[PDB]
Amino acid sequence: STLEIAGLVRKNLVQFGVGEKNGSVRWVMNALGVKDDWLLVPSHAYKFEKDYEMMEFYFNRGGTYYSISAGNVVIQSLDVGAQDVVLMKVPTIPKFRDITQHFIKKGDVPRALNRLATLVTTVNGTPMLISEGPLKMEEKATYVHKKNDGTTVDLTVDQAWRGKGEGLPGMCGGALVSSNQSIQNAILGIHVAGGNSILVAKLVTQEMFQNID
Ligand SMILES: *CC(=O)N[C@H](C(=O)N[C@@H](Cc1ccccc1)C(N)=O)C(C)C
């Protein structure tokens, strides 16, 4: 069921933020733990930050804020090319139950298309279940996002799910869960962009997780 997989996801979902070691943490979005001390994180969560010298990355896992210096982080790529979502290790993080196998197999991708799906996320504290779909897919495209005073955010994302939907900023980093019960309501990828009633998630497959250990 969708709920069952939403279940697994919620337990592994954390808030991701940036801040100085002894300063205010600025929560930017979500990150999803996948096993051990490894999480999936949209590169956009820190990629436009200015100062890496004194930037710690924060993860809120059960009301406690665990952290690691950007200078000390071990970051692993999911596949070749682009890199909009990476794998990050946070050695002091309370370990996640391995949900790697709930991730869709590359050859199963066509089974998620043209079905609805559910974006399982958080908006400051509050977890939500946002309906989307039916899902489309694009090898390459440039997508609209949120920032209203100096510069908007359009993102060229490769291998991306796109689903009609209405969301809110802060949703990025949440996981997309297929309603297709024949592929076990597989996690399809990570939400990376939301604008114009379209929701975009980078595809993340079971296979990409072979490159961590
Ligand atoms: C797509 C996305 O997540 N955008 C970010 C955003 O606007 N975040 C929220 C705050 C937040 C933090 C942690 C968990 C959920 C929500 C916000 N209204 O600033 C953006 C920072 C890229």
Side-chain angles (χ1 to χ4, degrees):
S1 118
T2 293
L3 287 176
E4 164 164 16
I5 295 320
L8 302 175
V9 171
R10 284 244 70 86
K11 290 239 138 16
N12 279 26
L13 211 41
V14 300
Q15 278 190 300
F16 172 102
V18 269
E20 295 197 44
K21 188 116 201 111
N22 324 83
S24 191
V25 171
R26 162 167 70 283
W27 301 104
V28 163
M29 50 170 90
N30 304 276
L32 179 70
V34 295
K35 90 149 132 175
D36 286 336
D37 44 5
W38 286 98
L39 305 92
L40 288 170
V41 199
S43 73
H44 325 59
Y46 55 81
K47 117 203 265 206
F48 304 87
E49 276 319 320
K50 308 39 101 159
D51 200 323
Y52 297 104
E53 186 185 343
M54 301 172 247
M55 169 147 93
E56 295 270 324
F57 285 150
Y58 288 103
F59 314 78
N60 174 8
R61 171 127 238 251
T64 298
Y65 311 163
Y66 301 81
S67 81
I68 184 119
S69 193
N72 265 291
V73 230
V74 180
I75 288 175
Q76 275 280 161
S77 46
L78 282 186
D79 205 348
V80 282
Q83 315 240 67
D84 298 282
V85 180
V86 305
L87 271 161
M88 222 190 252
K89 205 203 246 242
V90 189
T92 60
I93 207 134
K95 281 153 180 100
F96 298 96
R97 146 222 263 156
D98 182 357
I99 59 163
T100 62
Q101 253 100 85
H102 291 280
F103 274 81
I104 193 167
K105 268 146 155 177
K106 182 79 182 119
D108 277 347
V109 164
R111 325 260 260 107
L113 294 176
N114 293 299
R115 270 97 178 163
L116 283 185
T118 295
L119 173 58
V120 177
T121 358
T122 268
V123 156
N124 217 326
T126 11
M128 352 225 233
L129 286 201
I130 290 66
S131 165
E132 327 187 350
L135 288 189
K136 307 301 159 70
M137 175 169 274
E138 195 36 69
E139 203 136 47
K140 189 164 231 355
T142 286
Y143 298 93
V144 178
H145 190 41
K146 192 274 159 8
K147 291 286 156 183
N148 299 130
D149 49 313
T151 93
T152 186
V153 258
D154 307 5
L155 326 145
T156 319
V157 183
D158 283 353
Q159 275 205 145
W161 301 94
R162 332 146 33 221
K164 190 256 143 244
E166 314 107 86
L168 321 155
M171 295 196 312
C172 295
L176 181 73
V177 173
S178 184
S179 58
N180 193 339
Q181 317 197 140
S182 64
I183 54 161
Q184 300 85 20
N185 301 98
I187 303 155
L188 310 181
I190 294 322
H191 179 92
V192 286
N196 288 333
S197 285
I198 265 304
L199 303 184
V200 196
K202 156 95 179 286
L203 160 79
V204 180
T205 63
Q206 207 169 105
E207 294 87 23
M208 327 189 158
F209 298 123
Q210 291 167 149
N211 33 321
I212 42 206
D213 313 18

